[PDB]
Amino acid sequence: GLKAAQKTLFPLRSIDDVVRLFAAELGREEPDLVLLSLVLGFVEHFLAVNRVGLTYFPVADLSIIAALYARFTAQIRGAVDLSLYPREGGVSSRELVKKVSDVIWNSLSRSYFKDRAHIQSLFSFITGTKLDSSGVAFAVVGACQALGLRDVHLALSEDHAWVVFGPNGEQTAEVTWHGKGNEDRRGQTVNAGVAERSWLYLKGSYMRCDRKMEVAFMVCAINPSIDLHTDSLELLQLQQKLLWLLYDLGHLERYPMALGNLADLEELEPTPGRPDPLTLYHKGIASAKTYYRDEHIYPYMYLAGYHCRNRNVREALQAWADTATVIQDYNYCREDEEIYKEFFEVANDVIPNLLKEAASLLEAGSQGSALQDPECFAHLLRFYDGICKWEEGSPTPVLHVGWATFLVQSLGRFEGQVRQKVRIVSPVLTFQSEKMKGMKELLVATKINSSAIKLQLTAQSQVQMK
Ligand SMILES: COc1cc2c(cc(C#N)n2Cc2cn[nH]c2)c(C)c1CN1CCC(Nc2ncnc3sc(CC(F)(F)F)cc23)CC1
């Protein structure tokens, strides 16, 4: 290092002292990713993993943080001999990047639960020799910064992380694993994934971080959870304040998911004088439209969740229709299973529960119910249209008869006289999927023909012998 100027704020005795440290680092030429991740992991450990002895805030003494920092930098500098990997042009080589990745990978415990909480930070790596998937990628970038490799940066999709490096920052390399039971492609480019138009690689519209965005990533990576039923209020407040610091300095401009995280925190505990959660969700969507060709799913899912929690059924349906309008221009590939799981839960659990409560409230006399609004029926239909269009030309199918039962049920929550008011043109809606085009006639009849719907959604050829 640490440099004298980095040590002057220690000891850190409060959340605000941690915010001051981040402010100071973010004001430097290069914020120190290693320092910052160790501090966050230290504080998270003593606020979320082990709170024994806690009276206010775990004091971060310079002696403790400097020793962790020395362990990390000694481990990396000792194992990576830069003289074996000459750098032309102030840029790194694939071989060097792969070496840094191997060094991190080879340091990890042979066997542990990869999906647990609080194994994201360099604190976890040094004290537990444990990292989660994206934590390995972050640790590679931190190590490269420690080594003076200014061109190596974190690349992020909505379910994976890797690195960019090299001339013009144009090279990509895998540095960590993805999912469970996938074969690792460490060392390789991400071009085959981009070319196949999978969600995992976002058609190439993934985030290419600068150092400031990498700070934002580690802040998003804070995990306030103590257990299933309990969050650390101290860690929530710290994450919230750090995200505001980043927001004010301009560093969330290109980070849709961080804006959604901040909005969720503001919903929980609003900060006086700040934009409402809805404003922030909309800024996340604007960020994705501006910088990422509107190819991201999570900006709309964050918005839909907020409306769902607040029982704004119309607005929740509209936001989920929007999620599907993004997904329809992807191919569903092996390794996209996480987004399949989220669409499945929305279609087959969340929407049914929302419409079930809506139906009870309609029986109880509600006015302006989404169930009496044809535009809400149109959103439900656009949702299914997008999922069906996603499935077209994909190497793996999406829909099956499990989805059909819930579709029939959800359609049935709207009376015939409401469904009839939607105009399906080749309230007005156009279908992109051949499945929904063929279902059009079925969608307005007073009694929904359940078996014909099922056949059209699953493209089931035949009916029972017997
Ligand atoms: C499974 O998680 C969710 C599902 C969600 C929602 C909102 C909705 C809705 N509607 N859903 C779907 C759902 C709702 N109920 N049941 C499912 C939300 C808000 C979430 C919460 N997740 C939103 C995305 C957030 N992810 C991130 N947030 C910031 N940065 C990054 S970088 C990255 C890739 C990497 F991990 F590094 F490999 C991921 C990621 C993690 C938390």
C-alpha dihedral (180, 185, 190, 193), degrees to nearest 10: -50
Strands (E) across 221-366 are located at 225-227, 230-231
Distance, CA 419 to ligand 1 centroid (Å)? 32
3-state secondary structure of 361: helix
**Torsion region of 318: left, alpha or beta (phi above 0 gives left; psi -120 to 50 gives alpha):** alpha
* Of the candidates 178, 146, 181, the residue with the CA atom closest to the CA atom of residue 162: 178
C-alpha dihedral (40, 42, 44, 47), degrees to nearest 10: -140
The two structure tokens encoding residue 226: 């103590």
The residue nearest atom 2 of ligand 1, judged by CA position, is: 342
Give the span between the Cα atoms of 130 and 29, in whole angstroms: 30
3-state secondary structure of 230: strand
Distance, CA 161 to ligand 1 centroid (Å)? 14
284: amino acid identity, one letter: G
Could you tell me how far CA 380 lies from the centroid of its own chain?
A: 24
Give the span between the Cα atoms of 33 and 459, in whole angstroms: 52
Cβ < 6 Å from ligand 1: which residues?
134, 156-161, 220, 257-258, 261, 298, 301-302, 304-305, 308, 342, 345-346, 350
Distance, CA 338 to ligand 1 centroid (Å)? 10
Contact in structure between 396 and 337 (CB atoms under 8 Å):
no
Burial zone of 187 (CB within 10 Å; 0-12 exposed, 13-18 middle, 19+ buried): middle
The residue nearest atom 35 of ligand 1, judged by CA position, is: 160
Give the span between the Cα atoms of 121 and 218, in whole angstroms: 8
Contact in structure between 200 and 178 (CB atoms under 8 Å):
yes
Residue reference for tokens 């460490």: 186
Residue reference for tokens 């302006």: 368
Q: Which residues contact 158 (CB under 8 A, 6 or more apart)?
A: 199, 202, 257, 296, 297, 298, 339
Give the span between the Cα atoms of 440 and 201, in whole angstroms: 33
Nearest-atom number in ligand 1 for the CA of 220 is 29
What percentage of the chain's residues is helix, strand, coil (to nearest 5)?
55, 5, 40
Sequence length of the chain is: 466
The residue nearest atom 4 of ligand 1, judged by CA position, is: 342
Nearest-atom number in ligand 1 for the CA of 161 is 38
Give the span between the Cα atoms of 192 and 312, in whole angstroms: 40
The structural domain count of the chain equals 1
301: amino acid identity, one letter: M
Give the span between the Cα atoms of 220 and 252, in whole angstroms: 11
Could you tell me how far CA 116 lies from the centroid of its own chain?
A: 17
272 HSE (CA, 13 A, CB side):
0
3-state secondary structure of 184: coil
Give the span between the Cα atoms of 374 and 335, in whole angstroms: 36
Distance, CA 414 to ligand 1 centroid (Å)? 30
| Alpha-carbon Rg for the chain in angstroms | 25
> Which of 298, 315, 326, 327 most suits a substitution to test ligand 1, by most atoms within 8 Å of the C-beta?
298
Give the strand pairing for 423-424 and 428-429: parallel
* Boundaries of domain holding 409: 1-466
C-alpha dihedral (294, 299, 301, 305), degrees to nearest 10: -150
- Helical ranges in 197-255 per DSSP H: 211-220, 233-248
Give the span between the Cα atoms of 122 and 75, in whole angstroms: 12
Contact in structure between 171 and 143 (CB atoms under 8 Å):
no
Give the span between the Cα atoms of 416 and 438, in whole angstroms: 18
The two structure tokens encoding residue 211: 């150092």
Residue reference for tokens 């973010």: 26
* Of the candidates 290, 352, 301, the residue with the CA atom closest to the CA atom of residue 326: 301
> Which of 338, 342, 344 most suits a substitution to test ligand 1, by most atoms within 8 Å of the C-beta?
342
- CA geometry: angle at 222 spanning 274 and 97, to 5°? 120
For 72, list phi and psi in degrees, rounded to 5.
Answer: -65, -50
Q: How far is CA 436 from CA 362, 380, 454, in A?
A: 28, 12, 12
Max Cα–Cα distance, the chain, nearest Å? 84
Contact in structure between 112 and 130 (CB atoms under 8 Å):
yes
**Is the Cα dihedral 37, 158, 251, 280 positive or negative?**
negative
DSSP 167: G
Strands (E) across 82-182 are located at 153-156, 161-165, 171-173
Contact in structure between 281 and 263 (CB atoms under 8 Å):
yes
* Of the candidates 91, 92, 297, 133, the residue with the CA atom closest to the CA atom of residue 206: 297
40: amino acid identity, one letter: L
Nearest-atom number in ligand 1 for the CA of 137 is 37
> Which of 267, 301, 350 most suits a substitution to test ligand 1, by most atoms within 8 Å of the C-beta?
301
Strands (E) across 331-424 are located at 423-424
Residue reference for tokens 């991740």: 37
Q: How far is CA 459 from CA 325, 339, 347, 398, in A?
A: 21, 22, 18, 12
Peptide bond into 11 cis (omega under 30): yes
For 207, list phi and psi in degrees, rounded to 5.
Answer: -85, 130
3-state secondary structure of 426: coil
**Torsion region of 432: left, alpha or beta (phi above 0 gives left; psi -120 to 50 gives alpha):** alpha
The two structure tokens encoding residue 288: 């994705």
For 16, list phi and psi in degrees, rounded to 5.
Answer: -65, -35
Give the span between the Cα atoms of 135 and 142, in whole angstroms: 10
Give the span between the Cα atoms of 222 and 121, in whole angstroms: 9
Tally helices (H) and strands (E) across the chain.
Answer: 21, 8
The residue nearest atom 42 of ligand 1, judged by CA position, is: 261
144 HSE (CA, 13 A, CB side):
34
For 462, list phi and psi in degrees, rounded to 5.
Answer: -135, 160
- CA geometry: angle at 450 spanning 445 and 453, to 5°? 85
For 139, other C-beta atoms within 10 Å of its C-beta total 31
> Which of 141, 182, 209, 257 most suits a substitution to test ligand 1, by most atoms within 8 Å of the C-beta?
257
Give the span between the Cα atoms of 70 and 182, in whole angstroms: 34
Distance, CA 298 to ligand 1 centroid (Å)? 6
The residue nearest atom 12 of ligand 1, judged by CA position, is: 342
Distance, CA 122 to ligand 1 centroid (Å)? 22
Contact in structure between 136 and 176 (CB atoms under 8 Å):
yes
Q: Which residues contact 258 (CB under 8 A, 6 or more apart)?
A: 216, 219, 220, 243, 246, 252, 284
For 9, list phi and psi in degrees, rounded to 5.
Answer: -85, -10
Give the span between the Cα atoms of 99 and 377, in whole angstroms: 54
Resolution (in Å) of the shown entry? Answer: 1.7
Q: Which residues contact 47 (CB under 8 A, 6 or more apart)?
A: 54, 57, 58, 232, 234, 235
Method: X-ray
Contact in structure between 270 and 240 (CB atoms under 8 Å):
no
Q: How far is CA 118 from CA 33, 240, 291, in A?
A: 17, 18, 31
Task: Name beta bridge partners: 163.
Answer: 154, 173
